[PDB]
Amino acid sequence: LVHVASVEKGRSYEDFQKVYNAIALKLREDDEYDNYIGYGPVLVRLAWHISGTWDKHDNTGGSYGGTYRFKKEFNDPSNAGLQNGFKFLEPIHKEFPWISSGDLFSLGGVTAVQEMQGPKIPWRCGRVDTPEDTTPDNGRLPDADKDAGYVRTFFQRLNMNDREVVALMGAHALGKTHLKNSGYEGPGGAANNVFTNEFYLNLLNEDWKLEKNDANNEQWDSKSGYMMLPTDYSLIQDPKYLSIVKEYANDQDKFFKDFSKAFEKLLEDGITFPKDAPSPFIFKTLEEQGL
Numbered sequence: 001l002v003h004v005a006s007v008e009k010g011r012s013y014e015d016f017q018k019v020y021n022a023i024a025l026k027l028r029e030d031d032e033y034d035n036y037i038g039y040g041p042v043l044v045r046l047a048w049h050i051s052g053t054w055d056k057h058d059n060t061g062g063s064y065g066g067t068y069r070f071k072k073e074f075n076d077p078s079n080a081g082l083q084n085g086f087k088f089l090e091p092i093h094k095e096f097p098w099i100s101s102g103d104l105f106s107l108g109g110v111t112a113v114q115e116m117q118g119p120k121i122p123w124r125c126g127r128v129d130t131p132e133d134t135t136p137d138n139g140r141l142p143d144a145d146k147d148a149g150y151v152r153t154f155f156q157r158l159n160m161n162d163r164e165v166v167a168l169m170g171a172h173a174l175g176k177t178h179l180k181n182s183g184y185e186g187p188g189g190a191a192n193n194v195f196t197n198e199f200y201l202n203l204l205n206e207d208w209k210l211e212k213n214d215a216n217n218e219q220w221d222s223k224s225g226y227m228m229l230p231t232d233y234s235l236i237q238d239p240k241y242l243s244i245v246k247e248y249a250n251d252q253d254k255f256f257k258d259f260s261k262a263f264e265k266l267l268e269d270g271i272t273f274p275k276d277a278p279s280p281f282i283f284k285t286l287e288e289q290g291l
């Protein structure tokens with residue numbers, strides 16, 4: 001496969017900035033979801049799960065085809081709970097029927113991070129919806145019950161190296177795990193709907209205790225009321241990953257700069273951009289626009 005980026009016919013920066021402004025205004029408004037966490041966390045988890053099916057060996061999966069819209073990917077056990085992020089974005093797709101599904105699912109993630117006080121993420125338009133038979137089979141998304149060796153081997157299929165993997169995993173400060181979705185339960189820190197380096201600081205400063213939860217799965221619990229997954233806890237058990245965790249814990253700006261670069265790379269894997277294509281757009285936040 002080659003997947004060439006094609007701009008939605010006739011659309012420019014200001015059209016996309018209107019879809020972003022509409023996702024951000026609805027984030028402001030539906031602030032009660034999941035005990036007042038808001039939809040920001042499930043929207044960046046939707047943007048990474050539609051991108052994480054990519055396989056570098058044959059160019060299949062990835063964000064291009066917007067295939068989550070199909071039953072097979074939608075009903076994938078690893079995608080339980082993302083139906084909430086889909087339902088949120090659906091009125092917005094009726095308001096802007098011209099934007100592709102992959103472009104909308106991925107911009108939902110960019111909007112959520114920037115509106116949660118994260119770094120600016122450059123975003124590129126051009127994904128094209130593809131047929132139901134291009135939909136990737138289930139089982140390409142990662143297990144939580146595993147170690148640092150599995151994590152490194154997994155992220156190599158998306159050719160993400162160590163620093164990219166540690167920066168990307170910093171998004172687990174956001175939101176929480178839910179027992180009925182994944183068999184895990186609990187938050188990862190205090191500020192779980194503001195984007196900060198808190199995941200790293202909690203992983204270095206809490207007194208973590210291994211326990212089984214109500215689903216019979218193990219997780220790392222702390223006195224404070226926080227939890228970490230086995231794969232999260234892996235980042236301080238591996239010596240290469242641990243020097244990077246310490247770097248981000250001492251420097252949130254370096255974390256922002258590296259998360260920005262890696263999240264964009266994750267959203268654009270498997271897509272060729274012609275050089276006639278527009279440069280990546282930097283969207284303004286509501287606040288920047290006075291809205």
Ligand code: HEM
Binds near residue numbers: 044151177
């Ligand atoms: C080895 C990698 C990863 C594994 C095994 C993993 C696993 C999980 C699991 C089990 C949950 C809880 C789901 C639930 O019960 O609702 C979760 C939540 C979440 N994940 Fe990951 N994750 C990984 C990588 C990432 C990456 C790379 C991102 C983002 C760049 C990400 C973002 C999120 C977000 C934001 C949540 C919170 C969702 C919410 O509050 O509803 N994860 N993850």
